[PDB]
């Protein structure tokens, strides 16, 4: 059973640690089992522990005051862990989400190892870039490429993108499979340098040696 997710946070840091001083605000995750969308969503909103960044606000909307009463990552720690444990996590811009994930994990102080030890972390962007080199292979790009609509959807925020990623994911990994097509003692001659050739050689080495102060052939 495989898990499609992209986790939206209190903006990004472009510089230094993209996770430093940031925490999770929304989890939008869609469940895909046997390449069918079950609709068993874990879609929750979290404690910001900080200000939502002006840029992040404009991206998909979400107000700081809305995520204040909502529970913290500690109240859904085991809940979210068992939801993704032993399953496929392919995410867009993996550096961002993984950074946050492991960050929250260390904040629990239960010595819980990083998500990548019990869950399969794969970036989808890397795979798309590999498949379509020189094309924009962002999620929205691939969405439009495989004719998936992310504009006329009532679902706003993380759940929008999770849905889209699931469709993109299935499209790339369903494009079509393959007809695995088919996959002593002897003579020969020793050519001795003639006396003329030997003399040219000697003269050439003389030059090397007289001008440079060594001859490795005679060392």
């Amino acid at each position: 059973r495989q898990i499609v997710l992209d986790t939206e946070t209190t903006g990004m840091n472009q510089i230094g640690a993209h996770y430093e001083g940031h925490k999770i605000i929304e989890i939008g995750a869609v469940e895909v089992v046997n390449r069918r969308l079950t609709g068993n969503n874990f879609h929750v909103y979290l404690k910001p522990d900080r200000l939502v960044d002006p840029e992040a606000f404009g991206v998909h909307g979400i107000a700081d005051e809305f995520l204040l009463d909502k529970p913290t990552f500690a109240e859904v720690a085991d809940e979210f862990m068992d939801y993704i444990r032993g399953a496929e996590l392919v995410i867009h811009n993996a550096a961002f989400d993984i950074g946050f994930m492991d960050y929250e994990f260390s904040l629990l102080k239960r010595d819980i190892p990083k998500t990548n030890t019990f869950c399969k972390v794969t970036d989808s962007l890397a795979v798309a870039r590999k498949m379509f080199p020189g094309k924009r292979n962002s999620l929205d790009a691939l969405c439009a490429r495989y004719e998936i609509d992310n504009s006329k959807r009532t679902l706003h925020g993380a759940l929008l993108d999770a849905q889209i990623l699931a469709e993109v994911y299935l499209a790339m990994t369903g494009g079509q499979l393959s007809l695995p097509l088919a996959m002593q003692a002897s003579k020969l001659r020793v050519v001795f340098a003639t006396d003329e050739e030997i003399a040219a050689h000697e003269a050439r080495l003389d030059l090397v040696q007289k001008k440079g102060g060594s001859c490795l052939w005679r060392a």
């Binding site: 390449r35 299935l170 369903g174 494009g175 079509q176 499979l177 393959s178 007809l179």
Partner: peptide, 8 residues
């Protein structure tokens, strides 16, 4: 004849 599946 063989046509392959896509798995969606």
């Amino acid at each position: 004849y063989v046509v392959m599946p896509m798995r969606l």
